[PDB]
Ligand SMILES: [Ca+2]
């Protein structure tokens with residue numbers, strides 16, 4: 001087995017869902033909407049903190065590249081408290 005890839009489709013599919021606007025850029029607005037829909041009530045501070053951690057250019061928006069790398073790290077590497085919370089409530 002060890003085929004893997006389950007990440008490519010997972011990250012890609014999820015990313016496509018996160019970016020409702022489909023502009024290729026995730027914003028606190030979309031992130032917050034997803035968190036709320038998940039039955040979670042997080043404050044803007046938590047959302048902003050997540051963007052800052054992932055955002056390396058502080059453009060107020062997270063690009064696909066920032067998402068993939070961030071997801072790759074949080075997986076074994078570890079990230080902030082928000083990303084870890086999402087990556088924790090997901091698989092395990
Ligand atoms: Ca967007």
Ligand SMILES: [Ca+2]
Nearest residue numbers: 055056061062
């Ligand atoms: Ca960014």
